[PDB]
Amino acid sequence: ARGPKKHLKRLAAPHHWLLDKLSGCYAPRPSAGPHKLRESLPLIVFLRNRLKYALNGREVKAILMQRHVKVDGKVRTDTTYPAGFMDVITLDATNENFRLVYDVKGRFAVHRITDEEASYKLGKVKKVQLGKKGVPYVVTHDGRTIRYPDPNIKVNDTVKIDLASGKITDFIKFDAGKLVYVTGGRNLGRIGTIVHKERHDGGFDLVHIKDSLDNTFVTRLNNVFVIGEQGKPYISLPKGKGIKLSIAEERDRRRAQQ
Amino acid sequence: GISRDSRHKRSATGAKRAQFRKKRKFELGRQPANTKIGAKRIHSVRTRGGNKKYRALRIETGNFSWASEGISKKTRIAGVVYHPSNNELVRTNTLTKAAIVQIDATPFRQWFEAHYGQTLGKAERKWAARAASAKIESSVESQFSAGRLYACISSRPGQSGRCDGYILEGEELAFYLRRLTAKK
Amino acid sequence: PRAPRTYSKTYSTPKRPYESSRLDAELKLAGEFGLKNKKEIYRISFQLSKIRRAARDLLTRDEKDPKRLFEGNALIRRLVRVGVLSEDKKKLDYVLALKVEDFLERRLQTQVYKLGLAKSVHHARVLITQRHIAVGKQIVNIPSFMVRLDSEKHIDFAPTSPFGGARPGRVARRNAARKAEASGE
RNA sequence: GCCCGUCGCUAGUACCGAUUGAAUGGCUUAGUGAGGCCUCAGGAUCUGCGGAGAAUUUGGACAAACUUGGUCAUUUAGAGGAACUAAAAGUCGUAACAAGGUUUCCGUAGGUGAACCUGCGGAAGGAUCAUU
RNA sequence: ACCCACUCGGCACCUUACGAGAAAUCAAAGUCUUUGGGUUCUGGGGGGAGUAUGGUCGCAAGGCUGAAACUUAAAGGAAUUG
RNA sequence: UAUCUGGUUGAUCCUGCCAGUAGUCAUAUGCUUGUCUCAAAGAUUAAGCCAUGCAUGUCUAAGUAUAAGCAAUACAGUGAAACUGCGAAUGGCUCAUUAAAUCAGUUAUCGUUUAUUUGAUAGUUCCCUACAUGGUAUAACUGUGGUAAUUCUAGAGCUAAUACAUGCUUAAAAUCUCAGAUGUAUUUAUUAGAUUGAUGAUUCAUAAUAACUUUUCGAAUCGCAUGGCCUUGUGCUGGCGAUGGUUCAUUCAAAUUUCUGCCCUAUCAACUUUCGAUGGUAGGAUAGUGGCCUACCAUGGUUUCAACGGGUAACGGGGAAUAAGGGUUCGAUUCCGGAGAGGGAGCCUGAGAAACGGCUACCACAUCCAAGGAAGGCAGCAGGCGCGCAAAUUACCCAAUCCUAAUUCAGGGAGGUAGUGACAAUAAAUAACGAUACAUGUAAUUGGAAUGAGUACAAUGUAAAUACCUUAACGAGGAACAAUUGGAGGGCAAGUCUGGUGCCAGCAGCCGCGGUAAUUCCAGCUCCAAUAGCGUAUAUUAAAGUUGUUGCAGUUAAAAAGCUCGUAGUUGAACUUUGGGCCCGGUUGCAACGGGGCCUUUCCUUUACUUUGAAAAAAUUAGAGUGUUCAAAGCAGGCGUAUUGCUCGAAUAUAUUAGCAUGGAAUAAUAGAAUAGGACG
RNA sequence: AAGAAAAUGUUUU
RNA sequence: CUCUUAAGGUAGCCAAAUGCCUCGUCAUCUAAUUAGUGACGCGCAUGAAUGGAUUAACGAGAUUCCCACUGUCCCUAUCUA
Ligand SMILES: [K+]
Ligand SMILES: [Mg+2]
Ligand SMILES: [Mg+2]
Ligand SMILES: [Mg+2]
Ligand SMILES: [Mg+2]
Ligand SMILES: [Mg+2]
Ligand SMILES: [Mg+2]
Ligand SMILES: [Mg+2]
Ligand SMILES: [Mg+2]
Ligand SMILES: [Mg+2]
Ligand SMILES: [Mg+2]
Ligand SMILES: [Mg+2]
Ligand SMILES: [Mg+2]
Ligand SMILES: [Mg+2]
Ligand SMILES: [Mg+2]
Ligand SMILES: [Mg+2]
Ligand SMILES: [Mg+2]
Ligand SMILES: [Mg+2]
Ligand SMILES: [Mg+2]
Ligand SMILES: [Mg+2]
Ligand SMILES: [Mg+2]
Ligand SMILES: [Mg+2]
Ligand SMILES: [Mg+2]
Ligand SMILES: [Mg+2]
Ligand SMILES: [Mg+2]
Ligand SMILES: [Mg+2]
Ligand SMILES: [Mg+2]
Ligand SMILES: [Mg+2]
Ligand SMILES: [Mg+2]
Ligand SMILES: [Mg+2]
Ligand SMILES: [Mg+2]
Ligand SMILES: [Mg+2]
Ligand SMILES: [Mg+2]
Ligand SMILES: [Mg+2]
Ligand SMILES: [Mg+2]
Ligand SMILES: [Mg+2]
Ligand SMILES: [Mg+2]
Ligand SMILES: [Mg+2]
Ligand SMILES: [Mg+2]
Ligand SMILES: [Mg+2]
């Protein structure tokens, strides 16, 4: 209505953020940025609600303006910067890195990682196109454009991004039997292996995924993120590895600690 | 102002639509350029997104392509002889896309002579090479004897401010000559 | 504006306002359990009806259904934890067969009587209200407390509240202050 | 016993109603038409044969607004008229309920203080399930 | 033409009602709380009222369509005893 | 949470409504009102009118500082003013319009624009400055003024830029034209983009050619550190950034867009079409598609499967109340979408507005005035008037939530805090226990205890408070620190008690009660019901199988059309692979049940329907866990300690319309070869 | 075979 | 119930070209109306082929209002034969 909205009412924020209902009338609206509004995690939320380093937004800004936080290797002093899937958030003080991956329940889990693999990050190839002057380029899920990609890289593949030079180091192909993260839908946060890809020309492509426990679910091609091969994920998986325990076995796991 | 909305312009059943949402800027129209001939005057229109259109009023010269030799020489527009959409545009010499104009033909004469040199209508041996391809349509070469080449406007002068076009050739040329002989 | 705050009713009034047998049974319950008004009985009946409805909706599903199993065992777990349900009869069809007195017994006001902390149910209610009873390290002045079957062994007088504590009270202090002169000095 | 209508008393509610009644809004015919916008120009005076150019101005399209006529929707005043309803104990008769004292009722038509009466056809919901 | 037997179709009738129904009664008014063969029309307490209004048909009488305000605790069906 | 009861009668069984009964985050009102938690609140009528005050401004190290401002060899800090930039298009409010419109779900952009963010990206420019151009420039400021008055401005004198306007340097390599041309941007034409990238698909991406531009970009910008080499000179190189910049991609978006779905009405049956209605061609216009508009043409387009018209005391949805099932009703209002800012219209700026705390005009209101003129828009926050049955402070604050800006700092009536507040919801004081006297109870026979309602040191809580939580002291005896609101014929719990009145007064939802022995009025006493609440009115839901699809009734209670025809609609006989067998194989405990495959003459059009899957925001609903002291709630929290901390969670189900994908092929429909114009090879 | 006239009754128990 | 001489003005209609009183009363039309129209009706003295009521069309008939129009007027002036 007359221009872009700048506010985000609470109860209109993404549910994954696990924001308190009766805290205020508003939630941090993710600024324009690499990933998305709904699919992102604002740095204020990651710093105050997931890690409890800052007590409020003022302390979040105090953290960010003294150049502690760093997203994908860059300082990113923006409080509502939309850090999203597979972004690397390194804090030099309290020296540690996190990889923004989805837990089994679909929330952006706090996933502590070491520097030797925080060096890079993975990116799903959103599109492959010819740029100006006939230069090919790859657009990844995080809005990155990388020129002169390997001529064998197609859409729905994954590329390992150096994150120091922003170049392609390795690339995984979307194919049957490759490890996939689910980055949307009901099965968000689940990890499995591709069983089949149904084409549906003009429609949406479907893909069948078998997790390690042999549970098979079908989801749209839009929200499957290749992360490697069976047993060999190119990233450090979170505590649950995308197993999707039912509520009964979850209760059994909880009550196994007595 | 002018609206391109469809909230007016009653529904396909014939029902008169009630009004809501008083005219919005993003559905505006503007007035036609009504490009004339001679004494170039180009006005800048600030369009949506900060872009810019060029209303060409009173355009004198444009770039016209032969498309048989791929030359696209700049020439002066003599006048308008035919308009499929409105004869009044011909009468008022309004420059508009798809308008059939007459161009001076002199730059084309010069290029043809300097390139092939075969007395079209009245480094040495390059014409020896490009002599077999020197024959052109009788209905095209006959226009040079009068110094007026028929052409069709392909740009939108009201949008881009240019009056580019192409020389009529072949079946298109024959069609427009038949219409000209029927209406003249 | 801020998100709305959810609130619910905790009771339900009877359909027939003047059923003589219902009125007599309610007054019997009020006398037996030292209740202030019929609203406490209404609240207990409302909770019991909610529990019975949940049990019926579970029973209408085929046995060994995941939802039936999960929510059922949750319901028995909660009921045996509060003490209303019997350890023996954990099959949810003996949840269907519960009664209001089962919930009225697990009240803190009822338990303060049943443990000898008070000489009447109404004395127990008064003792709870006047900040004399603690459950653990916590004074509880709510007569409807639903002792969790793990606080039953721990219900005792408070460190404050000079009946099981160490203080001299207030009216006793005033009586002693006046008796200092009343004795002659 | 019960009961029907006219006619009297009182109260209330709608309806009709001269006023070429009134008001409001939508749509609409024919007119007038501000204003900004595009455009034909125009050229204070600030300038270095050129440029920027205010007032002013041509023709357009968009059109507020007003007048007139029509239509619809909604509301509303009105001399007066004519019904209906209600209301402890009014007048006239007694039409119906019994074969209600002329069986009742329907349709239709006429008459008539009032219920009603009468003609023609019909029904039994009749006072006849019945005369080999 | 008649008599006997059978049959299809018809106007009906007698008995009993398994059944139905408030009952009177009903071979349908049955096969309806064990509620579904198909389908059309109509009713939603009594009045106001088949009135007002608009429409339409009619020469007219009128017909078809058709309210509301307001009013009211009954009106009504079948049967029982007087 | 599958329930009824009173009222037609002398009695009966019905029909049938009236009445009762219960709920309502459902309003209002009466009486009453002690405590804690939570907190709806000028929607309904008047999208009626508004005094006053506030609600939008914004500066970093990093655009412009000579304030004649403050401070201890160009300025160097701070920095009012102003120029520049950005924002002011978000928020907040309201529900007036609006009925295929909005909206919801689902689509599309191979039909477009997109400030910003993020990522990538620019050796090509010249026909006597680059060790850096101009005022074509001015604000602030100084000084001189006009007006009664406005956030009015004139004249005069300076001065800058990331304002405005100009304008070079980057060779090298490199192909065409006959020395020049070749970056990018625009426009046209042409070529390739194959069977040398992408798509289901393109005139796609992209490239190439020839040209074309009232010139687009290709930093004359800023901060901080200074380094290396060195002919140590006005040397050559060189760091981290800020800001700006073309194109592309991305993000925030926007605009159009597919399919299906809206309440009542026929006392609306034809509508649209001259003045665009439906389509075609061309053009114009637009950011772009499109009758969006124009010209010519064709006569189309919608409709009983309800068009069109009319009403709506209609914004749509998420949802709410009630609900055995099926439903009925509500949804101005916390979130989403739309629309509006007194009514219209027009427009500037800007990426984005047809903006209204922007402008212009008319209309209606309406304000100052010195009469010349000038100025307006509370459906933002308070507040006032009015309207009404019907709704609160002209309070405090940016501390939290977030937003904006040049931005850690400023601003924010957004928002939060408190005030008012029996909207609604949670919890639950008004007593408990002994001794005397009599028959577990009894009463003005008495005692020791207990404590909060308040009051208040303090502390905490808070942005500062208030209050809650915690507590020094005080603070019960008819504990007067005194609970009410409705009732006592029936429905319906509770009086054949007393006085009063005497068909009066009055009660009574309904039936009824009152006519001098009133269980019904007015009272006293006593009792009943609910109880910090209770009553009344209205609306609505259940009851209502009194709207009936489930599931009503139509002989006589209301209702079968006088009768038949007949189009739409609804419905419509049976029949086409059935049945043997051999296997493999999952689930329950060899049996049962499911599934898949082979033969058996067989092998693996169009629909409806049904399965399954993805989908249908959150909040709300069900629901798991979790001692907010319990609870409503909330999404918290839990674990042993003298740590330089470990850890579980914020699940799960549901919307069965429409669309998508998928298995089945019973049921129901549809089509085949008949003048063979048939099938197969 | 058949057999003239006959109107009315206040309101609440 | 009567009596004057039979009946006793029904349906309609009206201060009507029929109403004295009368410029009736009420409404409307106007600034103002003995006018007009619509009502009312114990109507001096309305009323049924001495026809009553109403009526589309028609009228050099009588009447009121409105729009247009104008020297009818305000207020006269001028020209031609
Ligand atoms: K009486
Ligand atoms: Mg939108
Ligand atoms: Mg009689
Ligand atoms: Mg008789
Ligand atoms: Mg008689
Ligand atoms: Mg009858
Ligand atoms: Mg009725
Ligand atoms: Mg009878
Ligand atoms: Mg009722
Ligand atoms: Mg207190
Ligand atoms: Mg209002
Ligand atoms: Mg907004
Ligand atoms: Mg292209
Ligand atoms: Mg076109
Ligand atoms: Mg609604
Ligand atoms: Mg409305
Ligand atoms: Mg709403
Ligand atoms: Mg409203
Ligand atoms: Mg909203
Ligand atoms: Mg707006
Ligand atoms: Mg207003
Ligand atoms: Mg506006
Ligand atoms: Mg305002
Ligand atoms: Mg605004
Ligand atoms: Mg008290
Ligand atoms: Mg009494
Ligand atoms: Mg009783
Ligand atoms: Mg019925
Ligand atoms: Mg009947
Ligand atoms: Mg019949
Ligand atoms: Mg048919
Ligand atoms: Mg069949
Ligand atoms: Mg009698
Ligand atoms: Mg008469
Ligand atoms: Mg008269
Ligand atoms: Mg008259
Ligand atoms: Mg006159
Ligand atoms: Mg006669
Ligand atoms: Mg006469
Ligand atoms: Mg004549």
PDB file of all heavy atoms in Angstrom, chain F residues 99 314-317 331-332, ligand 15:
ATOM      1  P     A F  99     -21.001  -3.638  -5.474  1.00  0.00           P
ATOM      2  OP1   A F  99     -21.159  -3.734  -6.943  1.00  0.00           O
ATOM      3  OP2   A F  99     -22.024  -2.934  -4.668  1.00  0.00           O
ATOM      4  O5'   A F  99     -20.850  -5.110  -4.901  1.00  0.00           O
ATOM      5  C5'   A F  99     -19.743  -5.918  -5.271  1.00  0.00           C
ATOM      6  C4'   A F  99     -20.110  -7.377  -5.333  1.00  0.00           C
ATOM      7  O4'   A F  99     -20.370  -7.874  -3.992  1.00  0.00           O
ATOM      8  C3'   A F  99     -21.346  -7.719  -6.163  1.00  0.00           C
ATOM      9  O3'   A F  99     -21.131  -8.966  -6.820  1.00  0.00           O
ATOM     10  C2'   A F  99     -22.421  -7.899  -5.099  1.00  0.00           C
ATOM     11  O2'   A F  99     -23.504  -8.714  -5.489  1.00  0.00           O
ATOM     12  C1'   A F  99     -21.615  -8.531  -3.974  1.00  0.00           C
ATOM     13  N9    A F  99     -22.219  -8.388  -2.651  1.00  0.00           N
ATOM     14  C8    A F  99     -23.083  -7.416  -2.235  1.00  0.00           C
ATOM     15  N7    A F  99     -23.470  -7.557  -0.997  1.00  0.00           N
ATOM     16  C5    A F  99     -22.822  -8.700  -0.571  1.00  0.00           C
ATOM     17  C6    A F  99     -22.823  -9.381   0.652  1.00  0.00           C
ATOM     18  N6    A F  99     -23.525  -8.983   1.711  1.00  0.00           N
ATOM     19  N1    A F  99     -22.070 -10.495   0.749  1.00  0.00           N
ATOM     20  C2    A F  99     -21.368 -10.885  -0.318  1.00  0.00           C
ATOM     21  N3    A F  99     -21.292 -10.330  -1.522  1.00  0.00           N
ATOM     22  C4    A F  99     -22.050  -9.227  -1.583  1.00  0.00           C
ATOM     23  P     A F 314     -25.734  -5.382   8.215  1.00  0.00           P
ATOM     24  OP1   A F 314     -27.050  -6.064   8.181  1.00  0.00           O
ATOM     25  OP2   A F 314     -24.545  -6.131   8.683  1.00  0.00           O
ATOM     26  O5'   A F 314     -25.437  -4.804   6.761  1.00  0.00           O
ATOM     27  C5'   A F 314     -24.187  -4.214   6.443  1.00  0.00           C
ATOM     28  C4'   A F 314     -23.194  -5.241   5.964  1.00  0.00           C
ATOM     29  O4'   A F 314     -23.607  -5.788   4.689  1.00  0.00           O
ATOM     30  C3'   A F 314     -21.787  -4.742   5.703  1.00  0.00           C
ATOM     31  O3'   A F 314     -21.035  -4.588   6.890  1.00  0.00           O
ATOM     32  C2'   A F 314     -21.234  -5.805   4.765  1.00  0.00           C
ATOM     33  O2'   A F 314     -20.851  -6.962   5.490  1.00  0.00           O
ATOM     34  C1'   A F 314     -22.470  -6.142   3.931  1.00  0.00           C
ATOM     35  N9    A F 314     -22.495  -5.390   2.667  1.00  0.00           N
ATOM     36  C8    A F 314     -23.260  -4.300   2.357  1.00  0.00           C
ATOM     37  N7    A F 314     -23.057  -3.840   1.150  1.00  0.00           N
ATOM     38  C5    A F 314     -22.089  -4.682   0.633  1.00  0.00           C
ATOM     39  C6    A F 314     -21.443  -4.725  -0.611  1.00  0.00           C
ATOM     40  N6    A F 314     -21.688  -3.868  -1.602  1.00  0.00           N
ATOM     41  N1    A F 314     -20.522  -5.691  -0.808  1.00  0.00           N
ATOM     42  C2    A F 314     -20.280  -6.553   0.183  1.00  0.00           C
ATOM     43  N3    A F 314     -20.822  -6.615   1.394  1.00  0.00           N
ATOM     44  C4    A F 314     -21.733  -5.643   1.555  1.00  0.00           C
ATOM     45  P     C F 315     -20.335  -3.186   7.229  1.00  0.00           P
ATOM     46  OP1   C F 315     -19.990  -3.202   8.669  1.00  0.00           O
ATOM     47  OP2   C F 315     -21.159  -2.091   6.665  1.00  0.00           O
ATOM     48  O5'   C F 315     -18.977  -3.229   6.408  1.00  0.00           O
ATOM     49  C5'   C F 315     -18.133  -4.363   6.478  1.00  0.00           C
ATOM     50  C4'   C F 315     -17.540  -4.690   5.137  1.00  0.00           C
ATOM     51  O4'   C F 315     -16.500  -3.725   4.814  1.00  0.00           O
ATOM     52  C3'   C F 315     -16.835  -6.032   5.048  1.00  0.00           C
ATOM     53  O3'   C F 315     -17.716  -7.120   4.854  1.00  0.00           O
ATOM     54  C2'   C F 315     -15.859  -5.809   3.911  1.00  0.00           C
ATOM     55  O2'   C F 315     -16.534  -5.813   2.663  1.00  0.00           O
ATOM     56  C1'   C F 315     -15.408  -4.382   4.207  1.00  0.00           C
ATOM     57  N1    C F 315     -14.285  -4.371   5.172  1.00  0.00           N
ATOM     58  C2    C F 315     -13.034  -4.867   4.798  1.00  0.00           C
ATOM     59  O2    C F 315     -12.882  -5.294   3.647  1.00  0.00           O
ATOM     60  N3    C F 315     -12.035  -4.863   5.701  1.00  0.00           N
ATOM     61  C4    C F 315     -12.244  -4.392   6.928  1.00  0.00           C
ATOM     62  N4    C F 315     -11.234  -4.403   7.793  1.00  0.00           N
ATOM     63  C5    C F 315     -13.504  -3.888   7.338  1.00  0.00           C
ATOM     64  C6    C F 315     -14.483  -3.895   6.436  1.00  0.00           C
ATOM     65  P     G F 316     -17.569  -8.437   5.758  1.00  0.00           P
ATOM     66  OP1   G F 316     -18.873  -9.129   5.804  1.00  0.00           O
ATOM     67  OP2   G F 316     -16.901  -8.056   7.020  1.00  0.00           O
ATOM     68  O5'   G F 316     -16.557  -9.347   4.940  1.00  0.00           O
ATOM     69  C5'   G F 316     -16.799  -9.673   3.582  1.00  0.00           C
ATOM     70  C4'   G F 316     -15.632 -10.416   2.988  1.00  0.00           C
ATOM     71  O4'   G F 316     -14.546  -9.491   2.711  1.00  0.00           O
ATOM     72  C3'   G F 316     -14.998 -11.468   3.882  1.00  0.00           C
ATOM     73  O3'   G F 316     -15.703 -12.695   3.890  1.00  0.00           O
ATOM     74  C2'   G F 316     -13.592 -11.564   3.316  1.00  0.00           C
ATOM     75  O2'   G F 316     -13.600 -12.276   2.090  1.00  0.00           O
ATOM     76  C1'   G F 316     -13.309 -10.097   3.017  1.00  0.00           C
ATOM     77  N9    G F 316     -12.761  -9.418   4.202  1.00  0.00           N
ATOM     78  C8    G F 316     -13.435  -8.553   5.019  1.00  0.00           C
ATOM     79  N7    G F 316     -12.717  -8.110   6.008  1.00  0.00           N
ATOM     80  C5    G F 316     -11.493  -8.729   5.833  1.00  0.00           C
ATOM     81  C6    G F 316     -10.310  -8.633   6.600  1.00  0.00           C
ATOM     82  O6    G F 316     -10.112  -7.963   7.615  1.00  0.00           O
ATOM     83  N1    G F 316      -9.302  -9.422   6.078  1.00  0.00           N
ATOM     84  C2    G F 316      -9.411 -10.208   4.961  1.00  0.00           C
ATOM     85  N2    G F 316      -8.330 -10.905   4.601  1.00  0.00           N
ATOM     86  N3    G F 316     -10.507 -10.304   4.236  1.00  0.00           N
ATOM     87  C4    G F 316     -11.502  -9.543   4.726  1.00  0.00           C
ATOM     88  P     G F 317     -15.886 -13.509   5.261  1.00  0.00           P
ATOM     89  OP1   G F 317     -16.837 -14.612   4.999  1.00  0.00           O
ATOM     90  OP2   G F 317     -16.156 -12.553   6.354  1.00  0.00           O
ATOM     91  O5'   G F 317     -14.456 -14.154   5.518  1.00  0.00           O
ATOM     92  C5'   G F 317     -13.879 -15.028   4.564  1.00  0.00           C
ATOM     93  C4'   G F 317     -12.390 -15.160   4.750  1.00  0.00           C
ATOM     94  O4'   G F 317     -11.761 -13.853   4.716  1.00  0.00           O
ATOM     95  C3'   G F 317     -11.919 -15.737   6.069  1.00  0.00           C
ATOM     96  O3'   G F 317     -12.065 -17.140   6.168  1.00  0.00           O
ATOM     97  C2'   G F 317     -10.477 -15.262   6.119  1.00  0.00           C
ATOM     98  O2'   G F 317      -9.671 -16.018   5.229  1.00  0.00           O
ATOM     99  C1'   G F 317     -10.622 -13.855   5.554  1.00  0.00           C
ATOM    100  N9    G F 317     -10.817 -12.876   6.634  1.00  0.00           N
ATOM    101  C8    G F 317     -11.949 -12.175   6.949  1.00  0.00           C
ATOM    102  N7    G F 317     -11.790 -11.392   7.978  1.00  0.00           N
ATOM    103  C5    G F 317     -10.476 -11.596   8.365  1.00  0.00           C
ATOM    104  C6    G F 317      -9.721 -11.030   9.419  1.00  0.00           C
ATOM    105  O6    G F 317     -10.080 -10.198  10.249  1.00  0.00           O
ATOM    106  N1    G F 317      -8.423 -11.519   9.455  1.00  0.00           N
ATOM    107  C2    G F 317      -7.912 -12.439   8.583  1.00  0.00           C
ATOM    108  N2    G F 317      -6.639 -12.806   8.757  1.00  0.00           N
ATOM    109  N3    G F 317      -8.605 -12.972   7.599  1.00  0.00           N
ATOM    110  C4    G F 317      -9.866 -12.510   7.548  1.00  0.00           C
ATOM    111  P     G F 331     -21.968  -9.599  12.147  1.00  0.00           P
ATOM    112  OP1   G F 331     -22.265  -8.161  12.332  1.00  0.00           O
ATOM    113  OP2   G F 331     -22.413 -10.286  10.915  1.00  0.00           O
ATOM    114  O5'   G F 331     -20.393  -9.804  12.242  1.00  0.00           O
ATOM    115  C5'   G F 331     -19.678  -9.453  13.414  1.00  0.00           C
ATOM    116  C4'   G F 331     -18.242  -9.904  13.341  1.00  0.00           C
ATOM    117  O4'   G F 331     -18.159 -11.351  13.383  1.00  0.00           O
ATOM    118  C3'   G F 331     -17.491  -9.546  12.076  1.00  0.00           C
ATOM    119  O3'   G F 331     -17.084  -8.195  12.038  1.00  0.00           O
ATOM    120  C2'   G F 331     -16.337 -10.534  12.100  1.00  0.00           C
ATOM    121  O2'   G F 331     -15.356 -10.129  13.038  1.00  0.00           O
ATOM    122  C1'   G F 331     -17.034 -11.781  12.642  1.00  0.00           C
ATOM    123  N9    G F 331     -17.481 -12.664  11.551  1.00  0.00           N
ATOM    124  C8    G F 331     -18.750 -12.837  11.065  1.00  0.00           C
ATOM    125  N7    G F 331     -18.806 -13.688  10.082  1.00  0.00           N
ATOM    126  C5    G F 331     -17.496 -14.095   9.903  1.00  0.00           C
ATOM    127  C6    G F 331     -16.935 -15.012   8.982  1.00  0.00           C
ATOM    128  O6    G F 331     -17.503 -15.669   8.105  1.00  0.00           O
ATOM    129  N1    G F 331     -15.564 -15.126   9.148  1.00  0.00           N
ATOM    130  C2    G F 331     -14.828 -14.448  10.084  1.00  0.00           C
ATOM    131  N2    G F 331     -13.515 -14.695  10.091  1.00  0.00           N
ATOM    132  N3    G F 331     -15.334 -13.595  10.948  1.00  0.00           N
ATOM    133  C4    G F 331     -16.666 -13.469  10.800  1.00  0.00           C
ATOM    134  P     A F 332     -16.973  -7.432  10.636  1.00  0.00           P
ATOM    135  OP1   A F 332     -18.182  -7.748   9.842  1.00  0.00           O
ATOM    136  OP2   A F 332     -15.634  -7.710  10.069  1.00  0.00           O
ATOM    137  O5'   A F 332     -17.036  -5.900  11.047  1.00  0.00           O
ATOM    138  C5'   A F 332     -16.708  -4.875  10.126  1.00  0.00           C
ATOM    139  C4'   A F 332     -16.250  -3.641  10.852  1.00  0.00           C
ATOM    140  O4'   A F 332     -17.273  -3.229  11.793  1.00  0.00           O
ATOM    141  C3'   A F 332     -15.009  -3.814  11.707  1.00  0.00           C
ATOM    142  O3'   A F 332     -13.808  -3.728  10.961  1.00  0.00           O
ATOM    143  C2'   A F 332     -15.170  -2.721  12.749  1.00  0.00           C
ATOM    144  O2'   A F 332     -14.849  -1.455  12.195  1.00  0.00           O
ATOM    145  C1'   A F 332     -16.675  -2.762  12.981  1.00  0.00           C
ATOM    146  N9    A F 332     -17.052  -3.673  14.078  1.00  0.00           N
ATOM    147  C8    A F 332     -17.943  -4.711  14.009  1.00  0.00           C
ATOM    148  N7    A F 332     -18.106  -5.351  15.136  1.00  0.00           N
ATOM    149  C5    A F 332     -17.267  -4.685  16.012  1.00  0.00           C
ATOM    150  C6    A F 332     -16.986  -4.883  17.371  1.00  0.00           C
ATOM    151  N6    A F 332     -17.543  -5.844  18.103  1.00  0.00           N
ATOM    152  N1    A F 332     -16.103  -4.047  17.956  1.00  0.00           N
ATOM    153  C2    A F 332     -15.546  -3.083  17.214  1.00  0.00           C
ATOM    154  N3    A F 332     -15.733  -2.801  15.931  1.00  0.00           N
ATOM    155  C4    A F 332     -16.614  -3.648  15.377  1.00  0.00           C
TER     156        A F 332
HETATM  157 MG    MG I  15     -20.016 -10.164   7.036  1.00  0.00          MG
END
